[PDB]
Design a protein around this ligand. Structure first.
Ligand SMILES: [Mg+2]
Ligand SMILES: [Mg+2]
Ligand SMILES: [Mg+2]
Ligand SMILES: [Mg+2]
Ligand SMILES: [Mg+2]
Ligand SMILES: [Mg+2]
Ligand SMILES: [Mg+2]
Ligand SMILES: [Mg+2]
Ligand SMILES: [Mg+2]
Ligand SMILES: [Mg+2]
Ligand SMILES: [Mg+2]
Ligand SMILES: [Mg+2]
Ligand SMILES: [Mg+2]
Ligand SMILES: [Mg+2]
Ligand SMILES: [Mg+2]
Ligand SMILES: [Mg+2]
Ligand SMILES: [Mg+2]
Ligand SMILES: [Mg+2]
Ligand SMILES: [Mg+2]
Ligand SMILES: [Mg+2]
Ligand SMILES: [Mg+2]
Ligand SMILES: [Mg+2]
Ligand SMILES: [Mg+2]
Ligand SMILES: [Mg+2]
Ligand SMILES: [Mg+2]
Ligand SMILES: [Mg+2]
Ligand SMILES: [Mg+2]
Ligand SMILES: [Mg+2]
Ligand SMILES: [Mg+2]
Ligand SMILES: [Mg+2]
Ligand SMILES: [Mg+2]
Ligand SMILES: [Mg+2]
Ligand SMILES: [Mg+2]
Ligand SMILES: [Mg+2]
Ligand SMILES: [Mg+2]
Ligand SMILES: [Mg+2]
Ligand SMILES: [Mg+2]
Ligand SMILES: [Mg+2]
Ligand SMILES: [Mg+2]
Ligand SMILES: [Mg+2]
Ligand SMILES: [Mg+2]
Ligand SMILES: [Mg+2]
Ligand SMILES: [Mg+2]
Ligand SMILES: [Mg+2]
Ligand SMILES: [Mg+2]
Ligand SMILES: [Mg+2]
Ligand SMILES: [Mg+2]
Ligand SMILES: [Mg+2]
Ligand SMILES: [Mg+2]
Ligand SMILES: [Mg+2]
Ligand SMILES: [Mg+2]
Lengths: 134, 259, 210
RNA sequence: CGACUCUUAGCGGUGGAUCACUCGGCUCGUGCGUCGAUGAAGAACGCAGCUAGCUGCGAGAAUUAAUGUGAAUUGCAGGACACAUUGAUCAUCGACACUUCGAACGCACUUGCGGCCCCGGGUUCCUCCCGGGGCUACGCCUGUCUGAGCGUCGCU
RNA sequence: CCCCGGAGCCCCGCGGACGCUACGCCGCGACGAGUAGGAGGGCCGCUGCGGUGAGCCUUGAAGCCUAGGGCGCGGGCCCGGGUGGAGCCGCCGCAGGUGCAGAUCUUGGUGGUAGUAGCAAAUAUUCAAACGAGAACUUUGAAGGCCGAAGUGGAGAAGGGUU
RNA sequence: CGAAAGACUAAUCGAACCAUCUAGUAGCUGGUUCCCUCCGAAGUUUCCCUCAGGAUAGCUGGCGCUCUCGCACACGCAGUUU
RNA sequence: ACCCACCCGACCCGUCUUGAAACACGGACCAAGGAGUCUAACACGUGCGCGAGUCGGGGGCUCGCACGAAAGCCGCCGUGGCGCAAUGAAGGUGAAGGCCGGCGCGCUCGCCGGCCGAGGUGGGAUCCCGAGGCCUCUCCAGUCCGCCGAGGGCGCACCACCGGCCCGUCUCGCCCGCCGCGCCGGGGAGGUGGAGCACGAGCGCACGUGUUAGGACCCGAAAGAUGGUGAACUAUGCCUGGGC
RNA sequence: CGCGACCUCAGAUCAGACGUGGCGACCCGCUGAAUUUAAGCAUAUUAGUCAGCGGAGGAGAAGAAACUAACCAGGAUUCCCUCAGUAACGGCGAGUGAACAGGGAAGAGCCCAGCGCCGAAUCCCCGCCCCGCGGCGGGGCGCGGGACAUGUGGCGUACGGAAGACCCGCUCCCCGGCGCCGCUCGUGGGGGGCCCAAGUCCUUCUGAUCGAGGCCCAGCCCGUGGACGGUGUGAGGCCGGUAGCGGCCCCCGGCGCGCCGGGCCCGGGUCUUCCCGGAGUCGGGUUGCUUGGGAAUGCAGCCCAAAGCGGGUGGUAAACUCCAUCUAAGGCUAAAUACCGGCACGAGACCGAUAGUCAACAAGUACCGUAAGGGAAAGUUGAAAAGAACUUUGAAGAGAGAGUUCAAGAGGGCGUGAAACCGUUAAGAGGUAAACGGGUGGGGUCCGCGCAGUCCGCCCGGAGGAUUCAACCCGGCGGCGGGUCCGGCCGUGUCGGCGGCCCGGCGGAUCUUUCCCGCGCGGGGGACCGUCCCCCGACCGGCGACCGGCCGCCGCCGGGCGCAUUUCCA
């Protein structure tokens, strides 16, 4: 259960805070888990996805083992566009079919200084939590 | 329902002399709601018959002796495994139904150790039944923060808080009750009196310091003795097959004399 | 229309009472708020008693009750003068002081003075500075207590004295109670009329001499 | 066999009832309990590359700066940034800014007519004209200045 | 002059249902109208809640249709087929905004009337050509007309606000 | 306000329109939503500014109690007769 | 169960009414909504707990409230409500006699020591004693399983009556006591009024019905009051123009 | 013929400040009806109510007695319960209707004028130096101004006060600046930001699992985390979060310590002498409103108009006489209290698009009225627009193909798509309007059989087969019933040790202060009574509250049991 009386835990209110969330909260909602090699290397469970991360599609009709780069992260519909995850229209043009990032695993990150300090902060928090649980 | 609901309109009724029938209708306007109808339970919009009030007698207070009597009956039917199986608790490997465990049960701080204790006490089939009975609620309660339902499991009675409340906390079905703070709504949920209960040693010894025997006072309460039976020997089969009654009974008349 | 043997009732529901219904759904939250304010006050005054200052021995007026002993508004100034405590020092000590109370008796005065002496005996007065000045208490009787007193300080127990069964004499057996009560009623009724008769009889005795 | 009329069933139309969903109400409870001449509430008018309404904003006009966060916005174009750089977007917002009416303040309410100083064009203060900047509401409080009185007095 | 772990019987005083949800089962006798009204039983129906069914469900929930099989005196209910796509029901108890045929009832929709009444105030239109897929109404040419300078003309005010 | 008609006062005038009290009151009309079973009426007495209505008796339903027993063995009661 | 055919019956539902198929009223059809609810005071009946007691109101102590604004507890466990005592306008008063013996003239009255201890009659469900009868494979004796028990009782509840007691009021008369001897206080007998006593029965919660006050089953007026908006129409006066 | 002071009154775009107005749920001061009821109505009632006007605050108001009471007297105000639907008011009709006391929540006390004593010892503004100067504060330097004797400041206010006399033990409060250590209970004060566990494992349906099965213990792990939401379905482990006395980085606040500049030489008791009280105010008459207040409860208007052992009150008007209780006509003050407005939140036995707010949606919007005002209707494609490319008829709207999707039998007002109504097809019928009830008959759409359905369930006889075992013994295990109650625990009714009573707590309206402690009281002791327990022995019910042996019986497992027994197919 929840014991904090400030946490919402309401049906319509949580749906409101989900579907009317601003962009910096949508970035945290649209986070995806990492592969087992990346989890062993960084001790990081999940990360928000970026413009040019490498992605395997886990569930859906477009399920496969192909590592596809993200085309772009569209945070209004809570979706991402990947390179080879596309589909031909009636007029022959290909449109990228969006996949929700919960059905998305990261195989390679695009590392900059902000992502390095985020992963170091999360690894430090995991180390403090493991020391408190030990 | 709010007092302003239905009477925010200013609808004076068209009287006699027109084809309308004596309904308070909206005065003037070039609107869809213009001479339409309000101020009645039969009208679209408007207010209903008997607006529900906040000053309804919502709450009920019971006599203290009746509450103590019902909670003593609930504690008495927490025994008697024919009343526990008819409640619906899987019991088939429970070694003794007044299940009294050590005082080291409050010393646990891990749900893994609590699950292991329930498995060694062989009461884990009730929690397994709760996992099997986790399904969706029927009706309009899903949009009213009442989405999921499950059964009630082994009610655990603890004396002191040393981690037992933190331990039997995410295991679905277990309700924790303090010894001096026993709840009728958790000892007999839904009005049905039987309930599978797991006691501790310092709870099973403190029940005698709560309610006593018939020849001793409550000793923690001010003025409360145990109630008396209306009849003591309820085995009326044994009573009627005893020779002291059948010596005085006569011969029956069971020859079916039909027409 | 009343019919077939009911009470002749008078309900007071002829005003606009539904606008003025005072629903009491606030009151368990109000008990929680009073509990939180009381605990915050008890944490504020940390060595002091949580209930408050000492209340005197006070007997009920209005001969209905006439035997119960209550807690008072404060100790009176004659009680403080006999106990030897100044009225502006007693408020700083923690003794309730009100200047309105009379003191017509002697036994209630002496009882409140004995309560003030017992309270001054059992009170531990902490010094202001860590460098202890005069009229203070020892560091042993600084370390030996750090807790409050849950409840009213020196609670007033309405206790009755235990009597001994007597060996009744013929004098008390020959006393008549109802006749004495009726004679007291008659004397209280006719005390002034007989005084008027004695006055006019003395006036006639003076007029006989004159 | 006809045409037409009635009933039933299959299918197709008018219609939106039932059912299931709900970023919405209603009620109860808790914490705070804060507007304004340093210009409130409200109203009018404008502001987007393509913009009608809602929402947001004020000629700095779909927002400015700072901080937090960290790769977008999006319906389509476009251009910035190298996201190895105070750095796109969002939130906080404590700095800046906030047209006109409005208690509404120069007088009235047509956006009409003014008065007093200063500056820039006109000019080299010498008066017009134009633009910009600061004042000009009522009642009242302390003090200052100017006063009035065949109101009360000293010298002549 | 014996026991019924068995005299063997229309009765077994030896334990004693197939018949026993004892709030159950069974056996006789009489009776059965009904408004206003009163009482009782609903394993009749709707909604939500506490328990309960190791309940049902994308290998198809609710809802809807049915020229199918039925049950109950009845309220209604259980299946069979089709549509549907996501929740639903039985039992023990609790609660209510709980059952419609009417109220010149409220809202919404649709019929007969009915392809009917009507498109009749101020005299009037006709021929040829252009455009177009399409001409009685548009345009152009010609003819005949009307308003007849207190006009069916040319311009303002109030009002409308882009017409 | 009316050279006067109770005329006009925004299609409203023998007292305009809008909002509130207000869901004003009505002994007066209309309507009042599932099944089965059992019992089942009155338009009469008296009073009331009572005559379209109430109260009170009467008629009615439900809840019961106190007793008797076709198990070898009945006190009382009638829209009845003598 | 869908349609058709035949024979007999068969006027369109609701309502006001003595009487409706009515030339009485509402009504084209269909879907949805739609009308006896909630609080308080009572009254009666029922379910439960305790019992001359009952109830915790309100408040306080425990858990930080998921479940909770739940539950548990209280030298507050009784401050207080109701009941346990009523009757008078009120000052006030306020519910027990009987049997035995003694002292005054037993004077149907006053005063002292023991007992029964809440009266009596009738009708009274149940219970006790219960003579005797019924037997067994045979006659007597005979503890026992029994059933029916003629007759007599203590008599539950309840009803009728006669008594007795308390308070208010009326009549006739006497007696007793003192810190203050009085316009003192108390007592007897007999009428009568009371919602009284006569070895308790109430309290608290819940359910059903009925009567109310509240919007009060739902829809409905002609009205009244308060505060505002209109002389763009029209009524009239004025100012400034126009026309015949 | 003027000047200088004071007093009254002006003018300023004078220097510096305040108020205007809005919201108005709660609060205060007024004003203030009528519906309604009384079965009419007129007092009454609705009702100090709706409407109207002004005023603030986070609460407001009230508030420390010109009090309640009549008692062994209580002691500010506010709020809850009770008093109590009572006392009382009322065409004494309908109806209205408090208060004291008591139990609680909270609890906080005070300042003036006057009386007086201190050399105005007091206060406001401007110039300069020092401190931070973003709720302009402190010290000093100014024959720098002003207010003020028509009275500022200190002592001092009804609880008495002041000045002397001279007993007592003696020395800590506040203001303006600066720096420093403890993160400062909801278990880190408040605010903000970023984070913190475990399966997308294998197989398998689906369009897609979040479905189902399994995973060396119900399943693999985490659980101080199995609330919720999203993700193509029902997700503890996919993600955000969730729990936590978990972490990390800034801002603000109250606390303690140290330093400087400052202000203050501020007490208690006895005795001597003085002082001490708010005027058009109380009160009286009259009038109106109000109240439960009734020979006038409160408030106002007029008239009269005070006194000081006085005055007010003591619920019936008045006179006389003893009492009892307060000190009016000046003022301040948190807490317990109320909140349908606003900001931030949480919860629901509430409603689910004719419901719930008028408003789930571009809602006080479109629209109507000159205006005050009135005031709607309107949710759903799909998982994702993948929203139908292209060919062909038509000018096009419209179609026919083709395509997408599991599905358009979901095609931009599109989730399911009822009834009324309409069209078409099939069937039946038709001149007493249609329709209905009872009884049948005929024709249809479907259901249940059936190339005979005679359905079997037991027992017995016969001819075909057959694996084992029952009958009977041996060994082991489990169960039922029970005797002299066999031995022990356990268990109730009585008796015995009154033994636990001090190697047991509680309660008492039974005594003792032969006792102790804190000062005639309270607690702890000491006896007494009541309530709950220890050891063996007997009897009655060994009582379903348990065992270990013994006997009778039953069931299960492994052998000896070879075939007239035993059981299965036809
Ligand atoms: Mg509504
Ligand atoms: Mg449903
Ligand atoms: Mg207190
Ligand atoms: Mg409801
Ligand atoms: Mg209908
Ligand atoms: Mg025609
Ligand atoms: Mg025409
Ligand atoms: Mg023109
Ligand atoms: Mg006339
Ligand atoms: Mg019948
Ligand atoms: Mg009538
Ligand atoms: Mg009639
Ligand atoms: Mg009739
Ligand atoms: Mg008639
Ligand atoms: Mg009829
Ligand atoms: Mg006729
Ligand atoms: Mg009629
Ligand atoms: Mg009609
Ligand atoms: Mg309906
Ligand atoms: Mg009644
Ligand atoms: Mg009852
Ligand atoms: Mg009472
Ligand atoms: Mg009504
Ligand atoms: Mg009613
Ligand atoms: Mg009306
Ligand atoms: Mg009138
Ligand atoms: Mg104001
Ligand atoms: Mg009336
Ligand atoms: Mg009337
Ligand atoms: Mg008002
Ligand atoms: Mg105040
Ligand atoms: Mg005062
Ligand atoms: Mg008081
Ligand atoms: Mg009143
Ligand atoms: Mg002075
Ligand atoms: Mg989900
Ligand atoms: Mg989930
Ligand atoms: Mg996670
Ligand atoms: Mg009045
Ligand atoms: Mg007097
Ligand atoms: Mg008097
Ligand atoms: Mg809708
Ligand atoms: Mg709908
Ligand atoms: Mg709506
Ligand atoms: Mg709709
Ligand atoms: Mg739809
Ligand atoms: Mg489909
Ligand atoms: Mg579809
Ligand atoms: Mg949908
Ligand atoms: Mg869907
Ligand atoms: Mg559709």
């Amino acid at each position: 259960m929840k014991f904090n009386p400030f946490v919402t835990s309401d049906r319509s209110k949580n749906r409101k805070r989900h579907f009317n969330a601003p962009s910096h909260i949508r970035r945290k909602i649209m986070s995806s888990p990492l592969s087992k090699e990346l989890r062993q290397k960084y001790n990081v469970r999940s990360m928000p996805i970026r413009k040019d991360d490498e992605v395997q599609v886990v569930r859906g009709h477009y399920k496969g083992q192909q590592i596809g780069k993200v085309v772009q992260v569209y945070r209004k519909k809570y979706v991402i566009y990947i390179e080879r995850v596309q589909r031909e229209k009636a007029n022959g043009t290909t449109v990228h079919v969006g996949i929700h990032p919960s059905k998305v695993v990261i195989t390679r990150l695009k590392l900059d200084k902000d992502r390095k300090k985020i992963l170091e902060r999360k690894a430090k928090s995991r180390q403090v939590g493991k020391e408190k649980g030990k | 329902v709010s007092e302003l609901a239905g009477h925010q309109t200013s609808a004076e009724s068209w009287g006699t002399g027109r084809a309308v029938a004596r309904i308070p209708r909206v005065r003037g306007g070039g609107t869809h709601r213009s001479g339409q109808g309000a101020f009645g339970n039969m009208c679209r919009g408007g207010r209903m018959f008997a607006p529900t009030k906040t000053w309804r007698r919502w709450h009920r207070r019971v006599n203290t002796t009746q509450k103590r009597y019902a909670i003593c009956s609930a504690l008495a039917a927490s025994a008697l495994p024919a009343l526990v199986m008819s409640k619906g608790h899987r019991i088939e490997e429970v070694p003794e139904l007044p299940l009294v465990v050590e005082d080291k049960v409050e010393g646990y701080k891990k749900t893994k150790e609590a699950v292991l204790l329930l498995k060694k006490l062989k009461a884990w089939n009730d929690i397994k039944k709760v996992y099997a009975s986790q399904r969706m609620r029927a009706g309009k309660g899903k949009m009213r923060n009442r989405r999921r339902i499950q059964r009630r499991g082994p009610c655990v009675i603890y004396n002191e808080d040393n981690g037992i409340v933190k331990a039997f906390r995410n295991i679905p079905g277990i309700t924790l009750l303090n010894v001096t703070k026993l709840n009728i709504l958790k000892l007999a949920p839904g009005g049905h009196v039987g309930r599978f209960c797991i006691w501790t040693e310092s709870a099973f010894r403190k029940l005698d310091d709560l309610y006593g025997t018939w020849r001793k006072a409550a000793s923690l309460k001010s003025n409360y003795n145990l109630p008396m039976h209306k009849m003591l020997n309820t085995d009326l089969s044994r009573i009627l097959k005893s020779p002291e009654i059948q010596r005085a009974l006569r011969a029956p008349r069971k020859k079916i004399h039909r027409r | 229309a009343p019919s077939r043997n009911g009470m002749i009732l008078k309900p007071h529901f002829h005003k606009d009472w539904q606008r003025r219904v005072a629903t009491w759904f606030n009151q368990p939250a109000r008990k929680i708020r009073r509990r939180k304010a009381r605990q915050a006050r008890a944490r504020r005054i940390a060595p002091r008693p949580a209930s408050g200052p000492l209340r005197p021995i006070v007997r009920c007026p209005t001969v209905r009750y006439h035997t119960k002993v209550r807690a008072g508004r404060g100790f009176s100034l004659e009680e403080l003068r006999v106990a030897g405590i100044h009225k502006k020092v007693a408020r700083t000590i923690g003794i309730s002081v009100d200047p309105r109370r009379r003191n017509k008796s002697t036994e209630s005065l002496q009882a409140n003075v004995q309560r003030l002496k017992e309270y001054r005996s059992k009170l531990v007065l902490f010094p202001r500075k860590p460098s202890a000045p005069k009229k203070g208490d020892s560091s042993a009787e600084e370390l030996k207590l750090a807790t409050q007193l849950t409840g009213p300080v020196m609670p007033i127990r309405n206790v009755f004295k235990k009597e001994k069964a007597r060996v009744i004499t013929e004098e008390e057996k020959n006393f008549k109670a109802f006749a004495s009560l009726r004679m007291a009623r008659a004397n209280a009724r006719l005390f002034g009329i007989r005084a008027k008769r004695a006055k006019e009889a003395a006036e006639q005795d003076v007029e006989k001499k004159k």
